[PDB]
């Protein structure tokens, strides 16, 4: 997360850290962030799984404030099966969505706690006013230029961009489709050292807004050009466009 502030997992119980390993099992590296929707299902970004990993080589860790430092009440699960949206495009990142089924001993996997809780999926008709300030979280880079991921969970705050302003023109000629969302810090000349923004490592993480008293998921950190770049917003997958897909692929 570029800019923003350090946050404790309890402020974003729905954040998931997904780790993966290498040949010969030398060590499991931080892959991407995830979003907890139900006890055994977490969403993430399809692009994170472009290397076609064997499920049992993917570990989702819930309830963890520090990226690699194990939490007092965390919950580590192995992936049974992960579904990657078939129409996902690697160039345009169109359809950047995926589901990870958690492996458990019962009908429930993630046991709800003070540090582990689900996000409420957005209603089909969710129409949040342009410029409403939503927040995001992640263990990703602080600078896209940085060689290191964040040792600890971070949170930032972005303003939802109007439909019209979320176009190819406004994003250096990259393909922005109707399945994408734009949000980005809109401050200038303030007291803060960095524009708020997601960054490399935050992918798959949640962009949540307050809706009807509850924190509702609005988008999945998908892509962007740099991090905290003046007048360039960040792109997020429209979760509403995939409410249907989500319900359909959640097979036990």
């Amino acid at each position: 997360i570029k800019g923003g502030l350090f946050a404790d997992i309890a402020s974003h119980p729905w954040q998931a850290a997904i780790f993966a390993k290498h040949r010969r099992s030398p060590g499991e590296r931080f892959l991407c962030g995830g979003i907890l929707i139900s006890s055994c299902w977490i969403l993430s970004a399809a692009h994170c799984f472009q290397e076609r990993f064997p499920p049992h080589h993917l570990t989702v860790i819930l309830g963890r404030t520090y990226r690699v430092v194990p939490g007092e009440e965390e919950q580590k699960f192995e992936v049974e099966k992960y579904i990657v949206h078939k129409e996902f495009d690697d160039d345009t990142y169109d359809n950047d969505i995926a589901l990870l089924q958690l492996k458990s001993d019962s009908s429930r996997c993630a046991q709800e706690s003070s540090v582990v809780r689900t996000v409420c999926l957005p209603p089909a008709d969710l129409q949040l006013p342009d410029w409403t300030e939503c927040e995001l979280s992640g263990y990703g880079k602080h600078e896209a230029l940085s060689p290191f991921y964040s040792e600890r969970l971070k949170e930032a705050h972005v303003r939802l961009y109007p439909s019209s302003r979320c176009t190819s023109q406004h994003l250096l000629n990259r393909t922005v489709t109707d399945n994408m969302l734009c949000a980005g810090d809109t401050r200038s000349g303030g007291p803060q050292a960095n524009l708020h923004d997601a960054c490399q490592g935050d992918s798959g993480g949640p962009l949540v807004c307050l809706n009807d008293g509850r924190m509702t998921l609005v988008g999945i950190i998908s892509w962007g050009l740099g991090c905290g770049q003046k007048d360039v917003p960040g792109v997020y997958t429209k979760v509403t466009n995939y409410l249907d897909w989500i319900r359909d692929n959640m097979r036990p």
């Binding site: 309890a10 402020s11 974003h12 119980p13 003070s114 809780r117 689900t118 996000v119 409420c120 809706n211 008293g213 509850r214 924190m215 509702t216």
Partner: peptide, 7 residues
């Protein structure tokens, strides 16, 4: 339930 946290 979902959407709840600590503030």
């Amino acid at each position: 339930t979902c959407g709840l946290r600590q503030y």
